[PDB]
Amino acid sequence: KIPTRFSNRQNKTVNYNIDYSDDDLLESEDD
Amino acid sequence: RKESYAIYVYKVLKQVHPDTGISCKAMSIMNSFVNDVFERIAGEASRLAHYNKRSTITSREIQTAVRLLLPGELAKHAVSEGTKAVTKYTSA
Amino acid sequence: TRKESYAIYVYKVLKQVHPDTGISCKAMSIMNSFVNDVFERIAGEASRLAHYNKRSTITSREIQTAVRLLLPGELAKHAVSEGTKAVTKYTSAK
Amino acid sequence: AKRHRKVLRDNIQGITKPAIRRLARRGGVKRISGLIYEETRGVLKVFLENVIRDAVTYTEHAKRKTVTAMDVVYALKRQGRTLYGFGG
Amino acid sequence: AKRHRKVLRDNIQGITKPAIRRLARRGGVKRISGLIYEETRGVLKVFLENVIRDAVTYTEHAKRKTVTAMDVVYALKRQGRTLYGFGG
Amino acid sequence: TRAKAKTRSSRAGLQFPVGRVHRLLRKGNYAERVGAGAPVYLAAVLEYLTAEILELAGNAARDNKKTRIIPRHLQLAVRNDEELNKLLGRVTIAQGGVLPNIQSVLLPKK
Amino acid sequence: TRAKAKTRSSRAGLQFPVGRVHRLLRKGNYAERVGAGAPVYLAAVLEYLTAEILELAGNAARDNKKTRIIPRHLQLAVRNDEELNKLLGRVTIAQGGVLPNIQSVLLPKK
Amino acid sequence: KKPHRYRPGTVALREIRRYQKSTELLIRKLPFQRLVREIAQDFKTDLRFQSSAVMALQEASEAYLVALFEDTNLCAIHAKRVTIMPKDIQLARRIRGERA
Amino acid sequence: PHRYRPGTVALREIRRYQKSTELLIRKLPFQRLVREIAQDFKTDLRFQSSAVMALQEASEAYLVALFEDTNLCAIHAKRVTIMPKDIQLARRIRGERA
């Protein structure tokens, strides 16, 4: 459940979600 | 009888992420990474022992190789980790 | 203090290739550094070649393979020659 | 003349134009000129022969005729391009 | 206020603009913009901290207080910048 | 009357094998002698680096809604952390891909 | 009788010391054992590379009206040779300078 | 002969965003095997190849070409262009030290 | 008043300094810079003279190679004047920056 080990290094959080949406490109796609 | 690092990497993974698995290719990559870091640190410590006319490799040579190869906060956190492991191993 | 170096051997090789040409001390330091660097590179590659093949000894085959790996192109091709006959001449004597 | 040679010489042309275009798309390239592909094929051939020569040297040191994956890993490692996922 | 600090902090300004111009002349540069010198001072400082930090690590391993030239050669060789003419 | 044998990893409080690291140091042609605390220290450093990359890769797998770490998650974890990126700068991870980024001059408009 | 103690360099017809190379290979932590022909081969290769640089450096000293090889002549000999510029391509020679090279764009147009 | 043609560049941006997400090899396996065998028969005859050796060669070659294309794109952007040219590849390999 | 056109003096300096071999940075400012950089790592550091000379020779070698690649970047951008973005591009492609 809860991890027994963590990191003491002061890293910033990183969004690792590499899923992309082409909704900002619908101007030259369907509109 | 393949002499890998897979079970120890698995135990470390269950320490940091108890409900996350790992594929075979990722395990091979992790084993290659551990072997690469081992040979880098051991080669740097061997060079450090040869530079100082010393016939032995101690924890000081490993510590200096860690501070030479690892950058930034990785270096000092690995030094703290290895130092407290050596302290725990000596006292007991 | 006896400090070893490749000074006299580089000097006599120079007298072979250029009998009327001298050399400065900084150039001898650079030549000594070159010989030490190439020795370290070839010996390290031969050590790795012996380790990958699960062999406990370094032979002339390992040095030949290290020379073929490290020395680029035709510089290898003559040097592989230049080592080999020397080994052959050593076999003619010892 | 139905008979010809078994060997093939235009195997560098097997790295096609859309393959180089896909490799440039992975590199973030938006527009590609038409002279890119021959230069890319020459660069790939130079890199491949540089790796393959060292791998073949590692193979003949072991007195073998089969180029294993470990020889390719060592050949890539010596020139400073460490590759993971095949050394274990 | 005749008294001031004994230590000096503007030693990166001791690498003067004519010195950077001479370095660019040896590099073959014909025309130099006015913002080149600050960037050159920055990259020289970054390179010097890297080499000096590795050399200080090599010094501190040997339990010494002085920094020898051989430690500098070790620090440069560890960064893939081997230097001939100072021993080794 | 031999005592109850316990591993050196349990003495050092580690998960990585101290004895295997000591045997690889002794047979690796690094020095004539190997000290006692050197395999302990090196196993601790290797375990810490494995812990850092495995935690970052588990975070990468969680952010992509997956329960198993694949080479893509390891590549994303390594390349998104700059200290691990410059530790493995000359290292190619197979089946890892690249970081998704597009240069700002290639974007169409505002 | 002990056959007057003929050296291995004279047996191999070399000028580089075979015995010193053997001692440096044995004490250099490279392998458990060192073969007999390995120091002969390595000394011959080192002697050939030394002769190859020194011939070109003597030619560079002769072209500059000098009877003494300085670091500048070594740098000119190394950088002007195509295959010596790949063996020492990541190597700085002190007091060596650079090759005189000006790009053709920067030349004046007549 | 249909309407609603796409602007030149947004399709390329779609393939940029698509191929930077995926991780598969972008070169077909059989032409790469033929290329590797054709290159390798110059150095030595009667050479056998493991499949994992060719796969490692393909992974390394694709990574090298992708990194070179990133440096080439930076070269082309630096020259106030958005089209890559052989001089951009030449400058990237010269600065990298391959042509130096 | 005798004058030279802008550029021929630059070509004369390029021909002069590519022939010479001495260091183009003065000794004491570089020594002061080395000591200032070194005192941020360890206090009370002594220095051999040959260590400062080796650090110097490495520094001019690195900067001359960087200026060569900077000139290549400037020529590729159809310019004869080097810019800080040329240094940034050279260090980016070389791999030192990113």
Swiss-Prot record, chain A:
Family from the record: Belongs to the SNF2/RAD54 helicase family.
Function: ATP-dependent chromatin-remodeling factor which functions as substrate recognition component of the transcription regulatory histone acetylation (HAT) complexes SAGA and SLIK. It recognizes H3K4me. SAGA is involved in RNA polymerase II-dependent transcriptional regulation of approximately 10% of yeast genes. At the promoters, SAGA is required for recruitment of the basal transcription machinery.
Effect of gene knockout: Decreased sensitivity to the cytotoxic effects of 6-azauracil.
Complex formation: Component of the 1.8 MDa SAGA complex, which consists of at least of TRA1, CHD1, SPT7, TAF5, ADA3, SGF73, SPT20/ADA5, SPT8, TAF12, TAF6, HFI1/ADA1, UBP8, GCN5, ADA2, SPT3, SGF29, TAF10, TAF9, SGF11 and SUS1. TAF5, TAF6, TAF9, TAF19, TAF12 and ADA1 seem to be present in 2 copies. SAGA is built of 5 distinct domains with specialized functions. Domain I (containing TRA1) probably represents the activator interaction surface.
Domain-related comment: The 2 chromodomains are involved in the binding to the histone H3 methyllysine at position 4 (H3K4me3).
Residue ranges, compositional bias (Acidic residues): 20-31
Whole sequence portion shown: 122 to 152 of 1468
Subcellular compartments: Nucleus
Annotated source species: Saccharomyces cerevisiae (strain ATCC 204508 / S288c)
Name the record gives this protein: Chromo domain-containing protein 1
Biased composition (Polar residues): 5-18
Other notes: Present with 1620 molecules/cell in log phase SD medium.
From Swiss-Prot, chain C:
Residues carrying covalently attached carbohydrate according to the record: 81
Subcellular location: Nucleus; Chromosome
Listed GO CC annotations: nucleosome; nucleus
Gene Ontology molecular function, alphabetical: DNA binding; protein heterodimerization activity; structural constituent of chromatin
Record-listed cross-link Glycyl lysine isopeptide (Lys-Gly) (interchain with G-Cter in ubiquitin), residues: 89
Record note on modification: Monoubiquitination of Lys-89 by BRE1 gives a specific tag for epigenetic transcriptional activation and is also prerequisite for histone H3 'Lys-4' and 'Lys-79' methylation.
Signal peptide location: none
Keywords: Acetylation, Chromosome, DNA-binding, Glycoprotein, Isopeptide bond, Nucleosome core, Nucleus, Phosphoprotein, Ubl conjugation
Physiological role: Core component of nucleosome. Nucleosomes wrap and compact DNA into chromatin, limiting DNA accessibility to the cellular machineries which require DNA as a template. Histones thereby play a central role in transcription regulation, DNA repair, DNA replication and chromosomal stability. DNA accessibility is regulated via a complex set of post-translational modifications of histones, also called histone code, and nucleosome remodeling.
Subunit structure: The nucleosome is a histone octamer containing two molecules each of H2A, H2B, H3 and H4 assembled in one H3-H4 heterotetramer and two H2A-H2B heterodimers. The octamer wraps approximately 147 bp of DNA.
Family to which the UniProt record says this protein belongs: Belongs to the histone H2B family.
Name of this chain's protein: Histone H2B 1.1
Annotated source species: Xenopus laevis (African clawed frog)
Residues included from the entire protein: 33 to 126 of 126
Curated annotation (Swiss-Prot), chains D, E:
Residue numbers bearing the N6,N6-dimethyllysine modification: 6
Sites of Phosphotyrosine modification: 37, 74
Subcellular location: Nucleus; Chromosome
N6-glutaryllysine PTM positions: 17, 45, 63, 65, 77
UniProt-listed InterPro entries: CENP-T/H4_C, Histone-fold, Histone_H4, Histone_H4_CS, TAF_TATA-bd_Histone-like_dom
Keywords (A to Z) from UniProt: Acetylation, Chromosome, Citrullination, DNA-binding, Hydroxylation, Isopeptide bond, Methylation, Nucleosome core, Nucleus, Phosphoprotein, Ubl conjugation
This protein's record includes keyword Transit peptide: no
Modified residues annotated as N6-acetyllysine in this record: 2, 17, 45, 65, 77
Residues the record lists as N6-methylated lysine modifications: 6
Cross-link (Glycyl lysine isopeptide (Lys-Gly) (interchain with G-Cter in UFM1)): 17
Main localisation: nucleus
Modified positions (N6-succinyllysine) in chain numbering: 17, 63, 77
Positions of modified residues (N6-lactoyllysine): 2, 17, 63, 77
Residue ranges the UniProt entry marks as DNA-binding: 2-6
Crosslinked positions (Glycyl lysine isopeptide (Lys-Gly) (interchain with G-Cter in ubiquitin)): 77
Keyword Membrane: no
Domain of life: Eukaryota
Pfam family, one: CENP-T_C
GO BP: any one term: nucleosome assembly
N6-propionyllysine: residues carrying this PTM: 2, 17, 30, 63, 65, 77
GO CC annotations on file: nucleosome; nucleus
Coiled-coil intervals, chain numbering: none
Subunit comment: The nucleosome is a histone octamer containing two molecules each of H2A, H2B, H3 and H4 assembled in one H3-H4 heterotetramer and two H2A-H2B heterodimers. The octamer wraps approximately 147 bp of DNA.
Described function: Core component of nucleosome. Nucleosomes wrap and compact DNA into chromatin, limiting DNA accessibility to the cellular machineries which require DNA as a template. Histones thereby play a central role in transcription regulation, DNA repair, DNA replication and chromosomal stability. DNA accessibility is regulated via a complex set of post-translational modifications of histones, also called histone code, and nucleosome remodeling.
Protein name as catalogued: Histone H4
Organism: Xenopus laevis (African clawed frog)
